């Protein structure tokens, strides 16, 4: 369960309308919900069980983990197979023992539109930007930690 206290290994936290998740840095892929590692291009005996993509590891083939399915060459949760969210992403409902839509910042699920990301709504940023000279900033429909109004880039300065 990715929370505001989660430290993304080789990644950084981003926030949407209904959840938080780890975004991998550079060309790394998710091996779990909070750890990013480099992906192998081929699957053989030396690279068996090695990560070949997000929630997928290396008759050799790249297969999604349990609960995930290959949809458009991407592993998504099984309950999100037939879910389209538009201005957002399908996630598993942590409050339901079901695929629901988490929307880009600025949009919220519209109860008048089958909870699709078609309603204008604000989302309070919950990120704890630990690094100095940084704060929570909004960009491309998500919240992430970035330099303040007087800093940029190794470390913000």
């Amino acid at each position: 369960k990715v929370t505001v206290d989660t430290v993304c290994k080789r990644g950084f936290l981003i926030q949407m309308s209904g959840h938080l998740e780890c975004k991998c840095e550079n060309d790394l892929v998710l091996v779990n919900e909070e750890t990013c590692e480099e992906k192998v291009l081929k699957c053989d005996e030396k690279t068996v069980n090695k990560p070949c993509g997000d929630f997928s590891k290396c008759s050799y083939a790249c297969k999604c983990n349990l609960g995930y399915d290959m949809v458009n060459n991407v592993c998504i949760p099984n309950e999100c197979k037939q879910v389209t969210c538009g201005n957002g992403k399908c996630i598993l409902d942590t409050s339901n023992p079901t695929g629901v839509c988490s929307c880009n910042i600025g949009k919220v699920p519209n109860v008048q539109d089958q909870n699709k990301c078609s309603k204008d709504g604000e989302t309070k940023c919950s990120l704890k930007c630990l690094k100095e000279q940084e704060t929570c900033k909004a960009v491309d429909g998500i919240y992430k930690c970035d330099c303040k109004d007087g800093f940029i880039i190794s470390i913000c300065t």
Partner: antibody
Amino acid sequence: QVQLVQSGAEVKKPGASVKVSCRASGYIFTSYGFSWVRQAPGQGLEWMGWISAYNGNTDYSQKLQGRVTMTTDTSTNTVYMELRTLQSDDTAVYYCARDRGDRLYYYYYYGMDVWGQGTTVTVSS
Amino acid sequence: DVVMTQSPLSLPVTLGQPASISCRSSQSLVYSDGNTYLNWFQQGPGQSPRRLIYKVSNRDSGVPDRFSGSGSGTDFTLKISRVEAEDVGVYYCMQATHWPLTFGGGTKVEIKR
């Protein structure tokens, strides 16, 4: 409503410069970026460049790198475009388009989703 | 730069009949995250382009059901199940997988007679 309103048509002499505005409305201006696309008469679309209203990252097309200048105004929601050394083949319709804020990472937003009305620029003596 | 090639240049269609436009890329459009990023735009006569399809097969808001996108890698197809009168115009495909963005040459839809 994420609407984009562009400025009126402009007529310039060869060798002069032109400034084109594009006022954004309906969303958080500083959370996204812009790309400018022109279209010669009877021809297709041509990508001119991209500028970030989030981090100020500008980027021009290599074929037209030496005569394009892009700026953004955070006070008044507007993205400007300055084209220098207006040649005769620069006569085209210039469009405004909302693009991504950071060119390095990709999230769940996909740019070029909203386009302005377009502005006509004619270069002639 | 990625070269986008559409076919045909002009597509005569009959009202109520299906239609399809081809778009081919010079390189694979599969991005580093596994997505493809192939957008389809519609430009009416004297109007601004509007994006009908985003990412692979996803339709933007307000796009009718008759429009549909498909394909993978370097070959893609925009299909119209039942062409209507307002569908005339020029259709462009654009890639965002590789920087910089590049558009297709365009495909002019006309009425066949």
